[PDB]
Design an enzyme around this catalytic site. Structure first.
Site, PDB file in Angstrom:
ATOM      1  N   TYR A  64     -24.815   1.240 -12.271  1.00 13.95           N
ATOM      2  CA  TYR A  64     -25.661   2.380 -12.649  1.00 13.95           C
ATOM      3  C   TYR A  64     -25.086   3.664 -12.033  1.00 13.95           C
ATOM      4  CZ  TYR A  64     -29.686   5.402 -13.191  1.00 13.95           C
ATOM      5  OH  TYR A  64     -30.498   6.449 -13.491  1.00 13.95           O
ATOM      6  N   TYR A 113     -33.574   6.485  -6.712  1.00 13.20           N
ATOM      7  CA  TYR A 113     -32.859   5.245  -6.660  1.00 13.20           C
ATOM      8  C   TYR A 113     -32.350   5.022  -5.232  1.00 13.20           C
ATOM      9  CZ  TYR A 113     -29.872   1.779  -8.917  1.00 13.20           C
ATOM     10  OH  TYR A 113     -29.324   0.593  -9.365  1.00 13.20           O
TER      11      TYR A 113
HETATM   12  N1  LIG Z   1     -32.694  -2.285 -15.861  1.00 11.58           N
HETATM   13  C1  LIG Z   1     -32.038  -1.056 -16.004  1.00 11.58           C
HETATM   14  O1  LIG Z   1     -32.510  -0.050 -16.567  1.00 11.58           O
HETATM   15  C2  LIG Z   1     -30.535  -0.976 -15.447  1.00 11.58           C
HETATM   16  C3  LIG Z   1     -29.739   0.184 -15.518  1.00 11.58           C
HETATM   17  C4  LIG Z   1     -28.442   0.005 -14.934  1.00 11.58           C
HETATM   18  C5  LIG Z   1     -28.045  -1.173 -14.351  1.00 11.58           C
HETATM   19  N2  LIG Z   1     -28.930  -2.193 -14.358  1.00 11.58           N
HETATM   20  C6  LIG Z   1     -28.474  -3.380 -13.586  1.00 11.58           C
HETATM   21  O2  LIG Z   1     -28.623  -4.512 -14.384  1.00 11.58           O
HETATM   22  C7  LIG Z   1     -28.678  -5.741 -13.515  1.00 11.58           C
HETATM   23  C8  LIG Z   1     -29.909  -6.472 -13.892  1.00 11.58           C
HETATM   24  O3  LIG Z   1     -30.574  -5.923 -15.056  1.00 11.58           O
HETATM   25  P1  LIG Z   1     -32.164  -5.704 -15.094  1.00 11.58           P
HETATM   26  O4  LIG Z   1     -32.547  -4.791 -14.060  1.00 11.58           O
HETATM   27  O5  LIG Z   1     -32.471  -5.456 -16.519  1.00 11.58           O
HETATM   28  O6  LIG Z   1     -32.720  -7.193 -14.685  1.00 11.58           O
HETATM   29  P2  LIG Z   1     -33.462  -7.802 -13.427  1.00 11.58           P
HETATM   30  O7  LIG Z   1     -34.382  -6.802 -12.799  1.00 11.58           O
HETATM   31  O8  LIG Z   1     -34.026  -9.163 -13.870  1.00 11.58           O
HETATM   32  O9  LIG Z   1     -32.231  -7.970 -12.425  1.00 11.58           O
HETATM   33  C9  LIG Z   1     -32.353  -8.658 -11.114  1.00 11.58           C
HETATM   34  C10 LIG Z   1     -32.128 -10.093 -11.303  1.00 11.58           C
HETATM   35  O10 LIG Z   1     -31.518 -10.666 -10.101  1.00 11.58           O
HETATM   36  C11 LIG Z   1     -32.270 -11.747  -9.731  1.00 11.58           C
HETATM   37  N3  LIG Z   1     -32.143 -11.812  -8.320  1.00 11.58           N
HETATM   38  C12 LIG Z   1     -32.548 -10.942  -7.337  1.00 11.58           C
HETATM   39  N4  LIG Z   1     -32.208 -11.291  -6.115  1.00 11.58           N
HETATM   40  C13 LIG Z   1     -31.481 -12.454  -6.253  1.00 11.58           C
HETATM   41  C14 LIG Z   1     -30.791 -13.327  -5.224  1.00 11.58           C
HETATM   42  N5  LIG Z   1     -30.738 -13.109  -3.939  1.00 11.58           N
HETATM   43  N6  LIG Z   1     -30.161 -14.451  -5.802  1.00 11.58           N
HETATM   44  C15 LIG Z   1     -30.097 -14.731  -7.089  1.00 11.58           C
HETATM   45  N7  LIG Z   1     -30.751 -13.946  -8.077  1.00 11.58           N
HETATM   46  C16 LIG Z   1     -31.444 -12.795  -7.602  1.00 11.58           C
HETATM   47  C17 LIG Z   1     -33.747 -11.539 -10.218  1.00 11.58           C
HETATM   48  O11 LIG Z   1     -34.567 -12.641 -10.185  1.00 11.58           O
HETATM   49  C18 LIG Z   1     -33.385 -11.004 -11.561  1.00 11.58           C
HETATM   50  O12 LIG Z   1     -33.027 -12.061 -12.520  1.00 11.58           O
HETATM   51  C19 LIG Z   1     -28.585  -5.058 -12.078  1.00 11.58           C
HETATM   52  O13 LIG Z   1     -27.243  -4.994 -11.855  1.00 11.58           O
HETATM   53  C20 LIG Z   1     -29.183  -3.652 -12.285  1.00 11.58           C
HETATM   54  O14 LIG Z   1     -28.765  -2.758 -11.319  1.00 11.58           O
HETATM   55  C21 LIG Z   1     -30.204  -2.168 -14.908  1.00 11.58           C
END
Ligand SMILES: NC(=O)c1ccc[n+]([C@@H]2O[C@H](COP(=O)([O-])OP(=O)(O)OC[C@H]3O[C@@H](n4cnc5c(N)ncnc54)[C@H](O)[C@@H]3O)[C@@H](O)[C@H]2O)c1
Ligand SMILES: NC(=O)c1ccc[n+]([C@@H]2O[C@H](COP(=O)([O-])OP(=O)(O)OC[C@H]3O[C@@H](n4cnc5c(N)ncnc54)[C@H](O)[C@@H]3O)[C@@H](O)[C@H]2O)c1
Ligand SMILES: NC(=O)c1ccc[n+]([C@@H]2O[C@H](COP(=O)([O-])OP(=O)(O)OC[C@H]3O[C@@H](n4cnc5c(N)ncnc54)[C@H](O)[C@@H]3O)[C@@H](O)[C@H]2O)c1
Ligand SMILES: NC(=O)c1ccc[n+]([C@@H]2O[C@H](COP(=O)([O-])OP(=O)(O)OC[C@H]3O[C@@H](n4cnc5c(N)ncnc54)[C@H](O)[C@@H]3O)[C@@H](O)[C@H]2O)c1
EC number: 1.3.1.9
Lengths: 297, 297, 297, 297
Positions: free
Chosen positions: B177, B187
């Site tokens: 991001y 953030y």
């Molecule tokens: N959602 C957004 O708008 C956006 C924008 C840019 C980047 N991202 C990135 O996308 C990725 C995830 O997308 P999202 O936010 O849509 O989904 P999300 O919120 O489900 O992502 C987090 C995931 O990681 C898992 N998780 C957390 N801690 C963990 C651990 N210790 N071990 C194993 N699994 C764990 C959660 O259970 C979950 O499946 C991240 O890299 C986030 O920074 C999202």
């Protein structure tokens, strides 16, 4: 720990008055003890030298020490013309261009040489873009090329024409704007493009001239110069406001601010810096969002 | 001219439901014919597998062709723990962690190996940051390290643990991001920092793994996922709105959109791309100002 | 999960043979089912259409499916001239330019319109720089402007002239080179500058055209195209070698590789990508040092 | 036009001798008239203060004016520990840590306050990475977190702990390395990652602290410090050589060079600069290829 340009001389291209960045750097270089030579656009020359004679810029020439800035010599100059054969008979026939002589890049350079023999600093503070009001989508090929010629290529032409007379260990510096890297709607007619080219050339030239003559080459990417309008109307006024609101440090930008950075940069203190784009814009370029966006309140 | 991942298998780390980017990429990989293996956070596992059994995600599993996505196997997983000796007795004693086994990075990897022998694609869709609500200025050392550990280092740990079982010519991809390169207030808790590290590692690893096993390494820098709130309250809702307003192309962002890019990237079509940060954010990152800033009307 | 450009048509500017990036993208677009229209430089036209008639490019037209690429129509074209009034009587009098008609940007565009009514994709694969062999320091103003005109402004001219006939949701794509961001000695005569301008315009236009017609605008920053020389002599041969050695993934670069990325990019799959500079250069741009530097062994 | 830090005081974190960048900046700040306070790693403290008493650094304390640099006070310090409760009984029990007191970030800061009441400049010249010799692929989670903690988070901890005692209009500055943006094989164990985080935080903090207290926040991305080895063996020696060969300006880099830039930056002259990564590396970062690559001769 001073910026010492004692016994150094700068040629500043793009001084027509006391209100731009160019005037500012001169001041700075002068505060640091450099010998100041000016290149004035030749339509602008007269009014310039006239008001200067008359004292009109006196308050604008005050140095920190209290003394007054000295301009050792004003040289007329049109940076879209390299050699005299290049001038259109219709330009050389215009009253303005008729009144002066030795105004091509090649000619200015020959003069300086004949007058001073050498220089140490080169400042480019030039720009010009006929269709700067139109969007690229509506910019003519000719209006686009014009911006590039006066705003980009001019630096290249000056550097190359002055290089033979630059003492090694010297430096040049140019003024850029962030509309080169990011979309800034309103800054049209190929100026954006022209600022992009300038920057890239800054790098290349740092290579060419660094290796060739031990000359440092850098550009400063500045903010909108000035303080607030009671009614921000027009592009600059707008940017000033926007920047005041949205910047990491909330304040206005002063020419002094850009000049000091410049002086620093062309100074020996800066012996390890070249092919750099230095931002002197109150940290605006670093922000991801605008603070004033209505979504945030 | 298809994206063909027929006879390829991906391991997707970070699937807990049908609402994140992770689910989206799986869908995409699956549309392109890859074999899907999931790594589910082990607190989340149960609800996940339960709703999946029950059909809760059925509408969210519809592929373009009309068929339904298949998840060949769900593997529990906590990416802050590499080997079993690393787990705090107090974690291994928690109901949740008590219910499953083989959940360390080292363990998950051993399983896959024992179950499938190999993989071709590696997807990281993980993140987590306890103090993500606080400003750096107020972020604890522990809260900061936690974000980095779960959000940065986890990729490194997965890559290294899976590498021995990745067929060369394979690829990995992670989600980043723009708060890594630019200031995006809100953030916090070191997420920004964590996204910065991830990106850099993306580059390095592309070198390490490219040279080591002919594996491509890339990250996708996405926008705020989702459509508009009737009342944009909270960080994401806000960003969605802001982006909708200020982006070069005015539209919302869908997961599908991120998934397709991913599928492309891990595909053979992308054989000349590595150590890249691909923006899939409706061109927001490229803008210099916000259109909605009040100064502009 | 296919790249489907069925029922879409592309106009590809800069095809003179089967050996450049341009030919490659056409192939790709064609593999994905797009309808192919070509714009051929008008000095080059003849030899082009002649060898194509004769079958000379037959092996170079083989698609993956085995069929052969079809070029629905070849349009002559000089992208330094927008309207007919712009042409120098001395150009219009040259044998080559004498043999064809409707070759200005304005004219080509009118034809397409009259022939097909619309388009969906716009590909720029054009470039040209008379003094490309000289260093900036030695580049003439005229040689510099020429590079910018044919290599930068041409994209702007095409976009604007074709825009009225582009179905919204369409895309354009152009070919860039990293000598815009970094010093690559050897790439002179303002090409570097021209590549810098192109990129910036890519951004701006993405804004202008995105908002104006829902058109995506992107550029691909490619590597040196081709495989190794037995004797790397000359600029390209050299770069190919250098890149093969120093890149994160050790391999050569193929046109196919650039074409696939392009096809992807102009495709609907890429609906969230605009104002991007995509590197398809085997990750070279990301490296900090050269592996082959003698200091390292 | 001097850099005047008369009546200003700086706290410099990361001085153990006269041979690093840290010593250099102190010198510079001191030349410009600032009051110098040092934070010394507490394993290193003794040897430091001992050699300093003895005159060992006398030649290294010579200022331009000829006088000798003064260190008003040396404060012991371990920037991986914020508050005293954080220290492992096994650390507090180590001879070294046993000999001193008030060495946590929270404690150092309280002292300064009690001793001087305030500060104006904050310099971070700290770093440390146990597994810096291993590739990411081989870096442990613990070795990675350690690098981040000592090399990244430490800045955050210092800024926040000193902020309440920084006169507004003050500045901080930190030392970075280009292995954050580009692949520099050899710089492993998460240092690269740590440098990436630092930079990003530089930006954010510039926002946080700029808005909060009118403090400027910048980082300087330096080159390999030092002159040539007769036998470049090891990482640094190598980089020095490489840089000497391949840089746009062929010369070595001196600490003086980095210090002057720093002094400038924390000075009032620099009132419009924040959230900047300034390169003081003889323009290396700007190059696209290595000049010494064997392909080029
Ligand atoms: N959602 C957004 O708008 C956006 C924008 C840019 C980047 N991202 C990135 O996308 C990725 C995830 O997308 P999202 O936010 O849509 O989904 P999300 O919120 O489900 O992502 C987090 C995931 O990681 C898992 N998780 C957390 N801690 C963990 C651990 N210790 N071990 C194993 N699994 C764990 C959660 O259970 C979950 O499946 C991240 O890299 C986030 O920074 C999202
Ligand atoms: N003013 C700002 O807010 C801002 C922001 C960023 C960059 N800059 C840059 O600063 C430089 C100038 O600063 P400014 O805008 O404060 O001053 P300015 O408006 O006076 O700059 C233009 C100068 O160039 C001269 N000039 C124009 N065409 C010429 C030609 N053909 N030959 C010779 N001289 C010619 C003008 O007479 C004038 O002195 C430009 O590079 C501009 O892009 C300004
Ligand atoms: N070839 C490489 O290694 C490489 C690397 C990076 C970028 N590129 C870029 O790819 C594009 C072209 O690829 P290429 O070099 O493989 O092919 P190329 O050398 O065939 O490209 C030039 C093309 O433009 C045409 N052309 C030149 N002047 C013209 C004018 N005035 N009007 C109309 N057409 C004109 C030529 O006839 C030719 O088809 C350029 O943008 C080039 O910079 C190539
Ligand atoms: N030396 C170079 O060529 C170069 C190039 C780029 C950046 N830098 C950066 O410059 C800074 C230091 O410069 P240097 O390498 O010349 O000096 P250095 O090697 O002395 O820097 C490390 C310093 O941190 C101190 N330190 C380590 N761990 C500590 C802890 N936990 N608590 C408190 N102090 C601790 C050491 O005792 C030492 O004073 C670092 O940021 C380094 O990355 C150096």
């Amino acid at each position: 720990l001073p910026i010492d340009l004692r016994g150094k001389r700068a040629f500043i291209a793009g001084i027509a008055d006391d209100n731009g960045y160019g005037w500012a750097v001169a001041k700075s270089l002068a505060a640091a003890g450099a010998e100041i030579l000016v290149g004035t656009w030749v339509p602008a020359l007269n009014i310039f030298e006239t008001s200067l004679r008359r004292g009109k810029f006196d308050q604008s020439r005050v140095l920190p020490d209290g003394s007054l800035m000295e301009i050792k010599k004003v040289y007329p100059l049109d940076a879209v013309f390299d050699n005299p054969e290049d001038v259109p008979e219709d330009v050389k026939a215009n009253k303005r261009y008729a009144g002066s002589s030795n105004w091509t890049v090649q000619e200015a350079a020959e003069c300086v040489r004949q007058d001073f023999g050498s220089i140490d600093i080169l400042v480019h503070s030039l720009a010009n873009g006929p269709e700067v009001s139109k969007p690229l989508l509506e910019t003519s090929r000719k209006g686009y090329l014009a911006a590039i010629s006066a705003s980009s290529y001019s630096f290249v032409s000056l550097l190359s024409h002055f290089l033979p007379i630059m003492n090694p260990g010297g430096a040049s510096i140019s003024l850029t704007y962030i509309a080169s890297e990011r979309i800034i709607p309103g800054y049209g007619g190929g100026m954006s493009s022209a600022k992009a080219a300038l920057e890239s050339d800054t790098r290349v030239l740092a290579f060419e001239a660094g290796r060739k003559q031990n000359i440092r080459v850098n550009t400063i990417s500045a903010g909108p110069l000035g303080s607030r309008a009671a009614k921000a109307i027009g592009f600059i006024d707008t940017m000033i406001e926007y920047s005041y609101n949205n910047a990491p440090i909330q304040k206005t930008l002063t020419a002094d601010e850009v000049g000091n950075a410049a002086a620093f940069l062309v100074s020996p203190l800066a012996s390890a810096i070249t092919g750099a784009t230095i931002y002197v814009d109150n940290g605006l370029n670093s922000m991801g969002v605008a603070l004033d966006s209505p979504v945030f309140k």
